[PDB]
Design a binder for these strands. Structure first.
Length: 45
RNA sequence: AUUGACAGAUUGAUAGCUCUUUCUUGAUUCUAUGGGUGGUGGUGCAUGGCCGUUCUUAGUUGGUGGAGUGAUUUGUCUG
């Protein structure tokens, strides 16, 4: 269910959706938003 | 398996209720069958408890004996 990256062989596995963690992001448009973070987080781009 | 939710959608609603979408939750719960659970739902003509009223008045029982075949009476009475 965390299979959706750009997977690679020998031996690196590169990731997608770059996190900005409070003390992986949803992506529809502009904003990045973190699921687990209890206070909800917004940064447009 | 179920949960928390941004900005729009939708809504009185800064209830993510349900969503167009996509991040998360980590076995608490969901799915159905049986069965519980709860109610200022019905019944005071199924009841308890409490209160009012009959009744602010003076009244009410049984023990032994007497009367009567008996229900009952006498005691509880003329003054």
């Amino acid at each position: 269910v965390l299979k959706f990256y750009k997977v690679d062989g020998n031996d690196k596995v590169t990731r997608l959706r770059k996190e900005c963690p409070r003390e992986f992001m949803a992506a529809h448009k502009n904003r990045t938003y973190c699921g687990r973070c209890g206070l909800t987080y917004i940064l447009n781009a």
